[PDB]
């Protein structure tokens, strides 16, 4: 995020980091229950990648994080990589997340819910802060 | 890249207005947000765009794509969760 600010630690408890086996953060995701993470299809997750829950500072060794293995990758069959449309994948975890003060689920909308133009929302992540 | 988790508030756009920036690249399963002085950027992909509804944070978008320079005056594009939630629920029910 360019021109954002640091979050309060633990205040976005559904936010996960997707890391490869070298420990490199490559994408975010959101917990929707103890066993499932929603992310983007174009992130190209495999079952060798790891879901990290409960993290704030990726440079700290002292946080009580959960490193969760992925059982199966469900890429939406309507995903179109040429247009990046329908850009969603579900990850089923091999090991359930343990919910706590710092790890819990985001709500999903109904299909008919309305979010109007001009509404102020929030996005979070560990993406670049400057290009 | 940052070590510490970042946040930003930003407004939702209509797809019709987002098309002034991105043209025919904007499809019905996308939602635009930003152009407000902040931008999602590389490494944010897959994470949440959440809006508060009836007191609870609800997943409205999934960070998807946008400007190759993360310009803060151009909207970011997110996967539109309302268009996708029926597939989420079908997948959870079957697995």
């Amino acid at each position: 995020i360019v021109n954002g600010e640091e979050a309060v630690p633990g205040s976005w408890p559904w936010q996960v980091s997707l890391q490869d086996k070298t420990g490199f953060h490559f994408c975010g995701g959101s917990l929707i229950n103890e066993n499932w993470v929603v992310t983007a299809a174009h992130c190209g997750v495999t079952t060798s990648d790891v879901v990290v829950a409960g993290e704030f500072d990726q440079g700290s060794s002292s946080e009580k994080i959960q490193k969760l293995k992925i059982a199966k990758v469900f890429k939406n069959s309507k995903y179109n990589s040429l247009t990046i449309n329908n850009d969603i994948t579900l990850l089923k975890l091999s090991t359930a997340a343990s919910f706590s003060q710092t790890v819990s689920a985001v709500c999903l909308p109904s299909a008919s819910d309305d979010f109007a133009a001009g509404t102020t929302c929030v996005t979070t992540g560990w993406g670049l802060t400057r290009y | 890249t940052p070590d510490r988790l970042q946040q930003a508030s930003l407004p939702l756009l209509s797809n019709t207005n987002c098309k002034k920036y991105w043209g025919t690249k904007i499809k019905d399963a996308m939602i635009c947000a930003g152009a407000s002085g902040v931008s999602s950027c590389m490494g944010d992909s897959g994470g949440p765009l959440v809006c508060k509804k009836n007191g609870a944070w609800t997943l409205v978008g999934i960070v998807s794509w946008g400007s190759s320079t993360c310009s803060t005056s151009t909207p970011g594009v997110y996967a539109r969760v309302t268009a996708l939630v029926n597939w989420v629920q079908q997948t959870l029910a079957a697995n």
Partner: peptide, 10 residues
Amino acid sequence: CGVPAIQPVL
């Protein structure tokens, strides 16, 4: 869902 135990500060 959707209600953090640690409240975000925006």
